[PDB]
Amino acid sequence: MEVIELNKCTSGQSFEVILKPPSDPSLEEIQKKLEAAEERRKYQEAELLKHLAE
Amino acid sequence: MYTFVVRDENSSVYAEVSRLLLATGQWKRLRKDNPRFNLMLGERNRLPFGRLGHEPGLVQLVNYYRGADKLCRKASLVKLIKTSPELSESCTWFPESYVIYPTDEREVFLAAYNGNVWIAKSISSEASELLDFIHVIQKYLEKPLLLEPGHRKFDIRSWVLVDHLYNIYLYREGVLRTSSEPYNSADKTCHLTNHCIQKEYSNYGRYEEGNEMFFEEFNQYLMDALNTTLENSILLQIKHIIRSCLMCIEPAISTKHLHYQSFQLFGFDFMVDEELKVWLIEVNGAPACAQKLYAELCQGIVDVAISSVFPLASIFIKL
Amino acid sequence: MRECISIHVGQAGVQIGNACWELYCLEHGIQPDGQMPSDKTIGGGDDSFNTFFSETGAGKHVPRAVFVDLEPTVIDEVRTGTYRQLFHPEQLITGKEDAANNYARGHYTIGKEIIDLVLDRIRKLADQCTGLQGFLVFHSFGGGTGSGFTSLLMERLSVDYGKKSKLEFSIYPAPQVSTAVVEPYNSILTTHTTLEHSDCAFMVDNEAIYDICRRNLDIERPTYTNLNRLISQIVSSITASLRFDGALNVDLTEFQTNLVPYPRIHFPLATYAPVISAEKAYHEQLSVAEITNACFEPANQMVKCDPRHGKYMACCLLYRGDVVPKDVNAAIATIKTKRSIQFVDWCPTGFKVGINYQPPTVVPGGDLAKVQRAVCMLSNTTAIAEAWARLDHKFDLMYAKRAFVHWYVGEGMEEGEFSEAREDMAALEKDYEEVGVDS
Amino acid sequence: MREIVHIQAGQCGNQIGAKFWEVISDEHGIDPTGSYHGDSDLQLERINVYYNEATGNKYVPRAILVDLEPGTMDSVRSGPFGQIFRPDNFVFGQSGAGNNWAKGHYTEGAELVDSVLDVVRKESESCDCLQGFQLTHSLGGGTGSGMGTLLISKIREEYPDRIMNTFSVMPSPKVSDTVVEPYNATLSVHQLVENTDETYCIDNEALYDICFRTLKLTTPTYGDLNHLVSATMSGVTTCLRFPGQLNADLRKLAVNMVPFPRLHFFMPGFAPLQYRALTVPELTQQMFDSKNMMAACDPRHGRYLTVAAIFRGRMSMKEVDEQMLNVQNKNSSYFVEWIPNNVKTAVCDIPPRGLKMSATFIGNSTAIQELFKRISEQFTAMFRRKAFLHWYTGEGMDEMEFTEAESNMNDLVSEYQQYQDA
Ligand SMILES: Nc1nc2c(ncn2[C@@H]2O[C@H](COP(=O)(O)OP(=O)(O)OP(=O)(O)O)[C@@H](O)[C@H]2O)c(=O)[nH]1
Ligand SMILES: Nc1ncnc2c1ncn2[C@@H]1O[C@H](COP(=O)(O)OP(=O)(O)CP(=O)(O)O)[C@@H](O)[C@H]1O
């Protein structure tokens, strides 16, 4: 059981005790995702408005 | 009205338990995947303990202790006994065993090898034959207590129930699974006292019905032949061994401060030598029961393990 | 001095954010009007508390925080609340209508229309920073905004602030505390999308806090205020090292370095002790040994699970109050011989300890009693995978029948994302198993 | 600010709509003149959801009154709270619909529909953020059934992203006006399946049975039936109208109550249906009782997909939670196991008038298929002989349109049975 890296100050202190040794998508890609979903909403709504028009 | 589910159809013991629950009119069986239950008779493998105790307004109980597999596996038991200070290598009531992979204790086993008969499992006097077969290699008790007449071998099965409060209950009725063939220290039928083996490879049922001798007969035998009782010569050691194993693993498996509760029925197997010393062979996490003892024991389970948590509207020895 | 920006998303994030900054002000001696008598350097400075607070010429100490919600009702209570003078109006961002417990609505539909505004307001705070460390993101798993918009935000933050660390405080859904039936969906969806963008995430199960408030505080039905003030104490204990003088976890990077060996497995388990009722007139002060032992009790964990049947990768002990290193070691030595503490073989069986002499601050009139010493243990255990398993199972039950799926598809999301997110969670559970379980 | 635009169409729709406004105006402390005289600010906190604020701090219902004959709307205007409604929101014709869906939907109704949409448009423009629409009507008549569903279709065309909510009164031979009611109801259900997000199924057979068997009324009138509907509508909209723990609107409700788009037909319930206060266990027991249901379906003949419950009054929140969990745990077989925690409860501290406490039930149960089966049998019995069809073909309809409506409702029934065996 060893205590290492003991640092002290006015606010308190810290240390480490050892007990045993061991044995991204770009902005463009995000925009496409958001726009692809938006266009899928637009298509679904257009189908609704078409269905209502009929 | 309490609710329960069944997730182990192959369970002989808990098939009777569920039957008794229904015969009270206060328990109702649910579908196997219904989460709104009070009691779970779970499966032997990969039981989802992680999903227990998260349903609002439900006290949940399960018929298995998570982590009890450490005691109920061949290699795990050997490792547990050696590495636990409360058991240690000087255990004295557990035969000299070594874990061998086909860690590990291969050199250490050979150092002790050099009566030199051992047995591999997961029987030979030559270490070369044992290793080439491969698991754990345990010292074979070459001097077992032999019943007369017959000059035959036996083992002792004890049923132990541990409730949610971690009370250790020993069933009064144990059983001796005896060999129907005479012992020969020079064919592994008179060496193995398993019921499935005796009912097949053996003179089966010659001396007692189905090679099962119960405590009252065995006690009377000890009094007539050795002028002693079962309690003194054997049960004291059995009760000691059971308590040693279960207390050792208690802080690892106890559900005292858990969001769910656990109980479990255990099957301890013992061997007795000619010096009337009791040796622990193994521990069964999902044991079966004797046919004539199903009625009493299963009712005992409902009474102390189930109804203690879910009260409705002793056959056990407390250790 | 290096700054940290806090981001609160959705109702849960905002209301918890309220509880935290209330506590922060009490700890640093900052009055609701923004004034801080302790600070002698007027209108500037690079003290430890400046990491969370900027300063104006009038001596006002302004939180480096942004509040975002897709509906105004929750944030409106901040604009007219006790700390209405504390925040700049720009920091408080609200939309018209919410995501309606729908991840897809918060992420795709509404998120697209407001994401640039949020990033711009965040950029405002970033320009005031001489050396921004990164971000602290507070949100729920279950809310449409908390799950949907947060994941989108985390993606864009990785783009605009690539070198910056991002920490999460996530609210795990519990039927005991006002959940919706679709919250398991939102939880898996947001965890999948946010996973590669979060360096370290602290999950808080509402079930755990609910039970702690019932058990320890004797509150039959805890309100959000009761829950959040308890959560704020844990959050404070975790972020105290960033706001005060010290040598442990002084920057956001240290959290990953000390707690997260494998990037995907970045969900440390938090455990706090002691939690004492303020109504309790007579109570004995617990010792260092007692509060440290309580860190290994499942009943004191932020997420209900069993660490006995898992393996540790890292462990950090954060003490506050009358605590000396001698008593800590005497406690640790004792605990090892009683508890089941199994570390992974490729890690040092040890503890990183941090101690702040100032005892935990409590809100006047609150439910929490003042204690002379308390501890928060941050341990990366594979046992926390139980929470993933529970959550994934509830996902599987509904998704097998495609229940509620049409709501998400109707918002422009593809059904494939459901399976993609679930497969990622399946892989995550497997990672925990390979690290924690033996054959 | 989550405003709702209310629409009431036809005789039944206007008579129940009027009663609804009388009840909630009282709960919000609004007098027949539209002036507030309450005692709590909790009454005014979410008043904007159903009321517009006038010049001199008067509150005017965001309600539109529609009919093809002036009779019922003359009664409403001369009613107790008749002066509270905006005069320009009275839209009516002179011809009537003669209990004919075709006249409401295709001929007489088509002439009046644009005038209604003008008022709808005007009310929507005065909303900070329109939450959705609410319609009260019957399915057995002509105006509420025919023109009502035409309105819904027209509204969805102009406001495709807004929630549509209906309180729809289902006809029954026990409380019948004409024999063509199954024709009108079947044609309407077809519309409701496609164009509503939430439909509360109010069965006149159930309303009658409750009045007769439970309330001990030997000769129930429409007024007695409407008292139950008015009380149910108040409880259903409680979390919309009053401040509380629950931060949710109509869309959040629809998202969590509707697992599959077509299956959005709810069984409403109410308790108690006296000066003796009810204990929480009693409220919970009665609320789940079939005799307190208003769809005339046996919940034990099916399974609950989702359940919402609203308790009103000052009571133990722990006891409420315990009793609700109790019912689920004691009857787990009547709740689908593939939707975890599918029963949610909300509590409002403010009780309705005349009760210290009450409970409102909203169930999405597969047992509702019994309601549609009943209508379908009555439909088929006449349609197989083309009985009374000339009333419809004389208005331009063809037999094919009846066959399609029948097919779609039988499909609806099969889909309910599909998830009852899941
Ligand atoms: N601990 C805690 N949890 C909260 C709080 N508010 C909401 N939650 C949890 O958050 C989940 C619901 O998500 P919300 O944050 O309320 O919803 P949202 O993020 O605003 O997203 P929307 O659906 O658009 O409203 C539920 O599981 C709640 O238990 C809070 O103040 N404290
Ligand atoms: N070291 C030993 N010395 C003597 N006999 C031994 C022995 N080890 C085992 N046996 C014999 O082993 C037989 C029991 O089987 P064992 O307990 O080894 O495993 P098993 O195959 O029975 C699995 P389970 O108990 O779960 O059914 C007994 O009949 C006993 O005679």
Ligand SMILES: COc1cc2c(c(OC)c1OC)-c1ccc(OC)c(=O)cc1[C@@H](NC(C)=O)CC2
């Ligand atoms: C606007 O008023 C309501 C709005 C909602 C609900 C509700 O019933 C209790 C209401 O009162 C009628 C609601 C309903 C059911 C749920 O599951 C069936 C759910 O997950 C969740 C809910 C609500 N959320 C909670 C935590 O109760 C949100 C939607």
Ligand SMILES: Nc1nc2c(ncn2[C@@H]2O[C@H](COP(=O)(O)OP(=O)(O)O)[C@@H](O)[C@H]2O)c(=O)[nH]1
């Ligand atoms: N509950 C209730 N049902 C009504 C009322 N008035 C009519 N009904 C029912 O509605 C159907 C008649 O439709 P109605 O609204 O009168 O015709 P409409 O004016 O063309 O819409 C019949 O099934 C009646 O039983 C009422 O005031 N209350």
Ligand SMILES: [Ca+2]
């Ligand atoms: Ca300063």
Ligand SMILES: [Ca+2]
């Ligand atoms: Ca005309």
Ligand SMILES: [Mg+2]
């Ligand atoms: Mg055996």
Ligand SMILES: [Mg+2]
């Ligand atoms: Mg919200």
Ligand SMILES: [Mg+2]
């Ligand atoms: Mg009429």
